[PDB]
Amino acid sequence: SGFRKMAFPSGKVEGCMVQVTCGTTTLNGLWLDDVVYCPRHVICTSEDMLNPNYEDLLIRKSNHNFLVQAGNVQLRVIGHSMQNCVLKLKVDTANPKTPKYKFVRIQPGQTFSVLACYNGSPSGVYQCAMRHNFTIKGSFLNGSCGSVGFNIDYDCVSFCYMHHMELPTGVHAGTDLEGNFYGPFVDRQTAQAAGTDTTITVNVLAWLYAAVINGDRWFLNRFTTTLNDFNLVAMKYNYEPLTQDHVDILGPLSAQTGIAVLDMCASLKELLQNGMNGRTILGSALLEDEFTPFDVVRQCSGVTF
């Protein structure tokens, strides 16, 4: 019993983190096989960041402008190339700790673990959700660029995020591991800001099922609503529309608890309309939207890796 914001064990990713230095800038790289991946803005100066042309900036660099350190062992760079907004640094040694891995791009509403790193050294691990405005609410200080986000499936690490920048509201933006940004953000100095965000409704419902599985039932009621009438109310509260696909994804949780999805939706509708009235759900006084249905199942059943 119990429900916590749980990250994946980070050991497989820790063995891939390196420090990359170009000029006076130092950040983190991801060392898989004989390639180190890092944000391409490692090659920029402060002056370059107003309007950089990264193609020009990279053609002016040599293999020896890049210092890669794997703990103490220096890695010799034998080639470099640009892949969208990430650099690929070819090194002369394959990482002996390379796990089975994939590069996957995630969807808004999905969660992943972040290994926050500084100077190539892991500092902490925590769980994040990709918001509907393609930002994440992370915890990142200066030097954390190149930290990666991932999921673990069986024994395979699915890398889905590398950190590039902090937006002026304190939320964070980055790329997938092919270097393509999540959302309309760019790795240069502009007026860019996060767009409006919505609450991830399917995740709130999942979390309410987690509460029922853990014995919080005070918010339940005898009512059921239709998909249509639920969405009319949830859209008024800045919640994402619920779809028949979302209902189907919630089926396993519906079966385990015996509460139909549209029956849970009637509880959510009342919670939105009345608030919580001084009570809590799974230790929170607000409706949590950063647990997916899979997160709930994995934590409320014995799944390991």
Next chain:
Amino acid sequence: SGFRKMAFPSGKVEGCMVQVTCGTTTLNGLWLDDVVYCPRHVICTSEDMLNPNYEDLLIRKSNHNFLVQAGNVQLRVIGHSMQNCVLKLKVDTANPKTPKYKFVRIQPGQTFSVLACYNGSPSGVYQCAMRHNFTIKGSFLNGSCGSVGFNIDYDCVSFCYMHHMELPTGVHAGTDLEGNFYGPFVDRQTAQAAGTDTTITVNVLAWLYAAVINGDRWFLNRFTTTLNDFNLVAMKYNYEPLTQDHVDILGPLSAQTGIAVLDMCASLKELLQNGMNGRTILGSALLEDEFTPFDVVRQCSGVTF
């Protein structure tokens, strides 16, 4: 910027987790050097748990009643002994992955990371605080006994908790790594229940400083209170008394923000007396008490491991 419930990177602990089987019971063990540590109730049957005499039960076991598996490699047990409520299984191979480590007992109010494990396989990592009633609010399913809690200091793993049981309110109890229980709990079937709990006041204040560092300032006010008048109000709300030592521990956070501790206490007093009135602090609608002052400093400054 940003503030998250962050665990330590778990790689160093993952390399120590093994599976221990005795009879039909399987749980987790901690393999350091040539010793495997696990809860002694691995030797019990369901019938034994009403009133076990563990000394009797252990003298009736042989080295070959214990199956230890490190991934696939079976470990040969060459001795066994009881250390309070933990078993020490001597194995013929030192763990090549043993980190620098210590066994430390923690205090209520302190936090640690938990590596939740099943059948010797890590499943997730999350942060916990030891409550004033010596329970933790963990996330543990059947098979998780022997999972350990730890802090990482520089390169040294300080083990402070091993999981033994779930209390009837869904909170969790276990021992330090010398096998001594946190709190008045025992590893047998009794009517034991968690005692009353209080809110960890020094941690709430630390978290309010984290909010100010992250730009939440709406709860601040121009007032200051004395230690004495603050405690009269906080004790009425089931908060732990604040001491001059707590004020001193909060000094660094006071200096970074320029807000005196007793000035922050006046904000907390008003939050307790008035509630939050529909607003949030660092994404929470209630006062969070599971971040220590060190947690705040470590996350609001570049500390790595």
